[PDB]
Chain length 313, copies 3
């Protein structure tokens, strides 16, 4: 098919600023070239210009609600467009609060989408359950229909419309979930594979079940929101909220290779890469290199190798 | 249920001294608070006062037999008491020679106990098979009934009484077993899962089989003796006898999460943590943090999250 | 049985020179002693004297063809001899181009041999498909019968005779395969387990299938060509072409333990160990120690322990 790259240098969904450099370091890693180097048709819609909102005091506990609501709103429009151009949207973040706009925009063109959320967190806190007030830990609550009604009128998000059901999403990699978040998981019956299930079943069965769970009834567009902190910090240290005991480099590549093979990948998010938090220059390149590898895998790069339909001998 | 914490700052079961600091660094890591932070009822019986035995020459090859026999004897009494108070005994070590007293004391109140021994070693050498003479590598030989008769009259252990059968114990994590020790394993028919079986089956099946092996016939109290060197040294370097190729942080957490879910955990040992052997200050905190994580997992902390029986929305 | 050690200090199959020190650092690690320490009958045929070929300009793109062809030719003779002495040949390399001579020499005495190739690469490029021109990435092409006819008359290799069929070899560990190489894999129907299959099935099933694939029809001599870069570089960094996401120390030991248990190990190669490329002195010892461990495992050393047929009690 074809790809649609869109940079989202946004950080207001959380405290640390370095995350807005994500699009920059990833593009610098030669992402667009590496992709073209494969059988990929790439179109870059550029880095979105996120208007500065000086007047943005908290809503109760929630911080920078207008800036986050605006950035997600803009992204949504940008994603819907690339999708209306028949391309796989690739959002380079940026903090995870942007998923509100990415999945929202994506669902405008494909309302029957299925979401796979690779993360160490569920990011399903509501404005009233959150304790940090950071919006990169609440995106999923704004997207679920079952939750519509537990979400107050938060400045900046009146454009939002819950576009996914509790049963159109699967979490993979969870190892740090808050109490209120766990309650929602169990109460709404969300399908998830915490690190415990990954250890018990193995990443092969997990993927088998995940794809089976979302594509059993029928085939439909797949959206992959990949938070780099889903992988163990020994692979991706340059990120804001790292948690030990995460998915390995291999497991990260396995997940994406399996998604590509479905041929249903429709939208992709690579979030939470923060070059400023790398304890060393090598820690930064280690994070960017791994993030790039996962992305290339999403678009065909296989560990067993690739070859064009021709006779090489 | 409820917990009973007891510190065992003892090192004479082996050469390096730093191990007696175990209770200190673990408590400093905020273990008692973290536990209370969960649905845990914690009672600390304090650090046991281990009397100094100046006159303790070797028995043949065996070193500090009187000091080890005395410390294990005292611990046994302390454990039996906390158990008679209806609490899960948590012994903070200290070298592994203390397991003689811990399992002994535990079996006084619950003679039908089952033991799961996570270690890189089997610690089943006899005074006559040991080559090091260090008692932290012989505890299991003093506890088995099948071996009663191959154990000489060692100064300090005339109070001991073999309280477990060869079929009431399962080893997990073995990767450094002496020749004589292997002979005993095969001769007595002890159930074990070396690193080879873990690689072959996966930690999920291993736990399935372990719990099935010990709880098949009927449900009974479970005693977990956790040696931190069972985990690969990249996770727990601050320990006396580290061996490469050990259990991962994840596998360590998987084992303990599964044990908790049985609801049969009765006694727990966290041994061989030596702050003095950490090549760096980070190596020490890395070891203590991991040791604390395994402990919290033993008492309920789940990677998928936890929540109280209440409506969070 | 018995072992036949032969050092192959050769590097001309690739650019970096340090690799010729392989036999030296491995022997220095006390390999011969550690082996004898087991129930092993060891005979060292010494390090082969590789004649200097000053006049060796490229053949098209292929570099040092005469030196490589000569060294492999000599090795072949040396291996056939040790095999005619009823011993398991152990070739200490040296770059992987030597496998041409090792498998060739081995097949002279045992034409029905089966090959297990642990590597991050397939080393199956032909003189015409290679892009590097380095011969350590083409050995397999000179050995297959299905390919005989796609290989030009390369100076130094007129002594070669394809001795194995596409179905007498299994790859394990692949994660960096060129386009032309992938074409050959799929076209000839070669059985391989890339890192993707290892993640999907687990190393236990992979070995089950590998041994089943090569020994299903009937039992036959097994040749194991072990490239140290098959293992992740966190275990073997001192090597020329390291690739992230490789086999773990444990998986490396699992493969070799399973091969030993077959009792069919006939020939073994330990290649690509380059002491000069270790970023630190510890990186060098880490690589040599792991390489030695894999070797000892090939000859009986088990993680669950070993014991002689005698009563230890
Ligand atoms: N980076 C993330 N998620 O990906 N942060 C969310 C963090 C933790 C916590 N649950 C919160 O809402 O603050
Ligand atoms: N720390 C331990 N075990 O946990 N040490 C025992 C070590 C090795 C050897 N088996 C011995 O008896 O000396
Ligand atoms: N060390 C090895 N293999 O083990 N090098 C081969 C490398 C890469 C590439 N395929 C080539 O032919 O250059
Ligand atoms: Mn996230
Ligand atoms: Mn996260
Ligand atoms: Mn122990
Ligand atoms: Mn141990
Ligand atoms: Mn190779
Ligand atoms: Mn290689």
């Amino acid at each position: 098919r074809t790809i649609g790259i869109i940079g989202a240098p946004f950080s207001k969904g959380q405290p640390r600023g370095g995350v807005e450099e994500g699009p920059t370091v990833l593009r610098k890693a030669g992402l667009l070239e590496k992709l073209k180097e494969q059988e990929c048709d790439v179109k870059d819609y550029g880095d979105l210009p996120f208007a500065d909102i000086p007047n943005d005091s908290p809503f109760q506990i929630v911080k920078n609600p207008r800036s986050v609501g605006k950035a997600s709103e803009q992204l949504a429009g940008k994603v819907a467009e690339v999708k209306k151009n028949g391309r796989i949207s690739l959002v380079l973040g940026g903090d995870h609060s942007l998923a509100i706009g990415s999945i929202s925009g994506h669902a405008r063109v494909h309302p029957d989408l299925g979401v796979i959320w690779v993360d160490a967190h569920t990011d399903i806190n509501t404005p009233l359950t959150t304790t940090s007030g950071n919006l990169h830990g609440q995106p999923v609550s704004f997207l679920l229909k079952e939750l519509k009604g537990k979400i107050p009128d938060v400045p900046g998000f009146s454009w939002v419309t819950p576009c996914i059901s509790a049963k159109d999403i699967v979490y993979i990699g969870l190892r740090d979930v808050d109490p209120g978040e766990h309650y929602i998981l169990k109460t709404l019956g969300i399908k998830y594979f915490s690190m415990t299930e990954v250890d018990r079943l193995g990443i092969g069965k997990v993927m088998e079940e995940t794809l089976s769970y979302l594509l059993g009834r029928k085939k439909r567009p797949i959206h992959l929101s990949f938070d780099v902190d889903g992988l163990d910090p020994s692979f991706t240290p340059a990120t804001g909220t790292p948690v030990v005991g995460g998915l390995t480099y291999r497991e990260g590549l396995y997940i994406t290779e399996e998604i590509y093979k479905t041929g249903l990948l429709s939208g992709l998010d690579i979030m939470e890469v923060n070059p400023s938090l790398g304890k060393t220059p090598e820690e930064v390149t280690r994070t960017v290199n791994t993030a790039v590898a996962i992305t290339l895998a999403c678009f065909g790069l296989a560990r067993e190798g690739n070859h064009k339909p021709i006779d090489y001998l």
